[PDB]
Amino acid sequence: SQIVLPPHLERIREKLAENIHELWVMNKIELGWQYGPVRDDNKRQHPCLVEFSKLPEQERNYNLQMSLETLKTLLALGCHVGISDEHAEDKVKKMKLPKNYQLTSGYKPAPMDLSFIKLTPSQEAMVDKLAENAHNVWARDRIRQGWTYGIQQDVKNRRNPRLVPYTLLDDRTKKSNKDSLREAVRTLLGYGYNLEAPDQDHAARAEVCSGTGERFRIFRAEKTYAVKAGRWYFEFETVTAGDMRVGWSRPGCQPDQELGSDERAFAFDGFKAQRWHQGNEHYGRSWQAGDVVGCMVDMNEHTMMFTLNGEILLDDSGSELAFKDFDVGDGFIPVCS
Amino acid sequence: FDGGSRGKGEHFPYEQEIKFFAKVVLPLIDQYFKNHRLYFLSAASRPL
Amino acid sequence: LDARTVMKTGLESVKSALRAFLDNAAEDLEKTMENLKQGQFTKGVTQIINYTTVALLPMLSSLFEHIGQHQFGEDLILEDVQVSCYRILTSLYALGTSKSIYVERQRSALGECLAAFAGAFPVAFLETHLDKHNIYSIYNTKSSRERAALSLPTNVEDVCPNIPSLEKLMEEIVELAESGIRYTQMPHVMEVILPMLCSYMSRWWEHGPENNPERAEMCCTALNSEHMNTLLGNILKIIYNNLGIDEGAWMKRLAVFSQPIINKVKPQLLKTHFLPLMEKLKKKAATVVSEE
Ligand SMILES: Nc1ncnc2c1ncn2[C@@H]1O[C@H](COP(=O)(O)OP(=O)(O)OP(=O)(O)O)[C@@H](O)[C@H]1O
Known part of the structure; x- marks a missing residue:
């Protein structure tokens, strides 16, 4: 809400919305839907095949705000706004598709092919x-419609299995919308305005929070x-x-x-390859998963030794102790953290 | 100094400039960079 | 130096300057070697040689040691960087093989700079049989039109005609070992060839099929643990036949460059193979020569 659209993004935006609704109706035709009065899967027909003016103004409106909100998200995530040259946008690239791919729309289905544009890995990350x-x-x-998650979709109880975190989202719909977003951003950049990906933050959250x-x-x-006396051995399996942390502790x-x-x-x-x-x-050195640490204590001469999968772990110097x-005190017992 | 070394006059107008450079700037480079060597090699591979 | 971040994000003048750095270094040692080989008889040339020995050998040695030990540098070395590196290797190796009193003063600086070069250089230049498989190869990357445009010999053998092939290098080092010749007659082999072979095999161990048996015959280079056991064996036989006189800290230099090979070979292979040198340490206790 706080951000606004710069004039350059706006006057490229109307053409972006045109291109997006066009690509929508053509993906509609490779899915194969036809033109009809009412939408139905068995009838395999849909009134929004015609251009935006003839297309139902309700759906034209929804296409347009979702496009503008998407690009406001582009701007709000910190995308570096930039233009190579306005000549690149003035020279819009306009091939013809084959006659079979041609549709009822007079204009061509795909002015621009995804082939000559190679989206940056940072761009796919974005x-x-x-x-x-x-x-x-x-x-x-x-x-806010009132829907809630349910493993089985029920229109009566407003249950939808798709209402899950995106990390758990279904692969099919995930890749479908994901490729739609591929092509949307690819057209955004290839139309002339080369948006630069934001900084790839390498900061690690480190998972400091715990239950x-x-x-x-x-x-x-x-x-x-x-x-209090003798030589003892016990093992720790990671x-x-x-x-x-594994070792010996006083009572x-x-x-x-x-x-x-x-x-x-x-x-x-x-974990830090450290004594404590x-x-x-x-x-x-550090252990990996499955490594076994053997702990030796010699309470006769008061020495302590450690092993990692058998080999003796050693100090910064060559000492194995x-x-x-240390004093005997009240004794030692095996301990781990 | 290369221009003036070919010339007959070996008097150097910037003698104290290069004195400062060689005997201050250069050694501090070495000390700073050997003290913070890991700071540069760290390249989002998460050392330290 | 940080090759990753420099190559992926760097300003173009800095890019050009960093290529020009080793390009100027390349032309420096090229004119140095040309004028020293032409100067069979005895101050500008002396100044160039002194600058070479004082700085160029340390600069290239330190840089190339860093590149090799940190194992990266792959994207640092691209178009025209490879050809700079091939010119440098041709000059330094051809004069580390040729014998002259001028070289005989700083042989060891060459003996350690050439070894660092072998570790840092990322394309298998000893072997040309399966060299086309290596994707990093400037031959494969640069394409036919640009290879014809650039001053390139268009043949990998013609790129480095002076250097010998690896297989005949190790058969000749085996021959020299079994001959038991002294360090005095042909020192150059035992101060440059051994360091470069060990650094080379050390870097390309994992590139060899013995670590990754997959993509068979798509391997860039072909090399085996038995080749390494032969190498370590004939190194030990060289430090064996050569004990009586002439002593030398080059013992310690070759030992430290062969430290990687003896570390990475298995301890079971260490047994019954390296016990000869431990027992010779006792056999040469009366002798003053230092080993290991
Ligand atoms: N309010 C609406 N009015 C008219 N048509 C709509 C409306 N909402 C969606 N559509 C039509 O449905 C298409 C896709 O529907 P939408 O993406 O909203 O489905 P959904 O409810 O999210 O689906 P799912 O069952 O996978 O959860 C749109 O492209 C448009 O043609």
Whole structure:
């Protein structure tokens, strides 16, 4: 609502709307619909075959605002507006289609072929968001009509399986409207006004948000199983690769603090390839999905070792000791975050 | 300086200009770029 | 340097300047080699040679090491960049093979710059049998009309006539190994050929079918792990036959350029194959020569 149409986009826009309704009635003829008084699939006929003036003014109106709203979405997504030269637009490219493809309309069905224009990958990336926005517009319109999602379409209860997020939208209708949007934007650029794609933002959302306030869970053995002397081994299997920490913790370890942040835990974060005890250093490499981490503690000389699929993980230097020196204290138990 | 080096007069009007350049501008380039080497190589491949 | 972002987004004068950089470097070492080979008898030429050794060898070596180690540069090297690179390789290799007292001073700088070139250069120039398969090839990209328009030999062999073929290079290095000749007679082989062959095979390991058996005979280049075992074996035999005298840090240079090959070969292949060098370290304990 806040944005307005610049005069250049407007006086190219009336011709854009003409071309769009033309392409609509010709896609209507390759789908094969004919001219008739009433629209019906069995009769395979449709009154909107004639040009916009003879075409029902109601449908002419709807074509026109959906075109203008689409291009306002183009402008509102941050598309770099620009023109190569007005001569390119003044030299509109106007082939003839074959006689069989010719229709009742006196003018030609396809003045311009998609062949000589090669849309930029950034342009298809843009038209992806354009399809997202068009689908969302249709969806809110149906919600305000009163429709709601249902696996089976029912006109009585206003149920539609198509009222789903576009990521889950059906592939058939998805690609149909998607190719319609292909050709719409391709004609927009090829008619003369070469809109430049917006900046391809490489910023990663990082998925910082999580369910509830809890951000990690700490799994540990019972405090009574603490070991104060001897050599011990246990394994950690990483089903999925991500932010996990495995190691040995003292029985006083807090369940709400990260492992290794305090002095009560000795952990290895392979996601960042880091050891964790009162801070983080660089230790070992990263694990992948399915990797198994074996944790060794030698409570005789107070050393700790880690493995990744068998091979010893090593420090920044050549030392294999993750933690050379620590007090026995009250013992250690296996722990993971 | 190439023009004046072919000339007989080897007096350089911009001697302190090039003194500043060579002994300040050049080393700060090296230090800055070795300190932030990763900053340039990072090319939307998400390092750091 | 950041070749990706420069090539996809860059202002045209910067583009032209970055091609002109290595074009000027190319003509620099071309005139340098021409005037030094013409100068069999002894100040402008001396200034050019000094500038060459001081800067051109470090500039090209550092740039090309960066390109090779970061494995990118493919879109950086396009029309006229390839031909600049072929002129540079022809000159540097032809003079690293030719023997002169002037070269014998900075042989090693050449020995490490030529190796960096081999890693950075993206088209298989040792092999021409299946070279047409390689899409990056300026021959395939540039098309017949432009290849006729450009000052191109129109034959891949004619592009680099001085350089030898890879298969005869490794059979001759095997022959030299079994002959056991000293480093003194023909040093050039063991300071340039070995580094370039190891850097070449190291870059094109994954291009070879041994990593991707698919698209068979559509492979750009053909190479095998057994060829690598032969290479490592005859390198060890070179560092074997050549222990008595002459010592040399070129031991350490060839070891560091062969570090990739011995790292990427399997440990089971390391066993029973490289234990000779560990036991020779004891066998040459009385000797002063340094190995590995
Ligand atoms: N309000 C309307 N008045 C007249 N014709 C209409 C109207 N709405 C749609 N049409 C006609 O129907 C065609 C396509 O219908 P539309 O895209 O609105 O269907 P839909 O309800 O979204 O379909 P679906 O069953 O897949 O959910 C239009 O091109 C036009 O010819």
